């Protein structure tokens, strides 16, 4: 499934709602072009891996989460679980999301 975080409020409730399932957050500029160009991959696993929780944060609408997350280099993918950061990596490597997702799966 997918869940757009509009504010820090939905951020915490989203991690607790996930439970123990994986939680990969994608920090990108939906308004940007070359950045939103990597959505047919990350946001695409929603139909391939229905057992994964994907969060889409807009560094422009939820600038509150971008500031607290200290995201200064988009796109940036972070791996959270039970509400704990257990991995993260910045780079336009769509193929890495696979090897990484299969890591804490």
Swiss-Prot record:
Localization in the cell: Nucleus; Cytoplasm; Secreted
Domain of life: Eukaryota
Primary location class: nucleus
Annotated site (Deprotonates C-terminal active site Cys): 26
BP terms from Gene Ontology: cell redox homeostasis; cellular detoxification of hydrogen peroxide; negative regulation of protein export from nucleus; negative regulation of transcription by RNA polymerase II; positive regulation of DNA binding; positive regulation of peptidyl-cysteine S-nitrosylation; positive regulation of phosphatidylinositol 3-kinase/protein kinase B signal transduction; response to nitric oxide
Residues that bear N6-succinyllysine: 8, 94
Modified residues (S-nitrosocysteine): 62, 69, 73
Processing after translation: In case of infection, ubiquitinated by S.typhimurium protein slrP, leading to its degradation.
Keyword tags: Acetylation, Activator, Allergen, Cytoplasm, Disulfide bond, Electron transport, Nucleus, Redox-active center, S-nitrosylation, Secreted, Transcription, Transcription regulation, Transport, Ubl conjugation
Stimuli inducing this protein: Up-regulated by ionizing radiation.
One term under GO cellular component: extracellular exosome
InterPro entries in UniProt: Thioredoxin, Thioredoxin-like_sf, Thioredoxin_CS, Thioredoxin_domain
Protein name: Thioredoxin
Species this protein is from: Homo sapiens (Human)
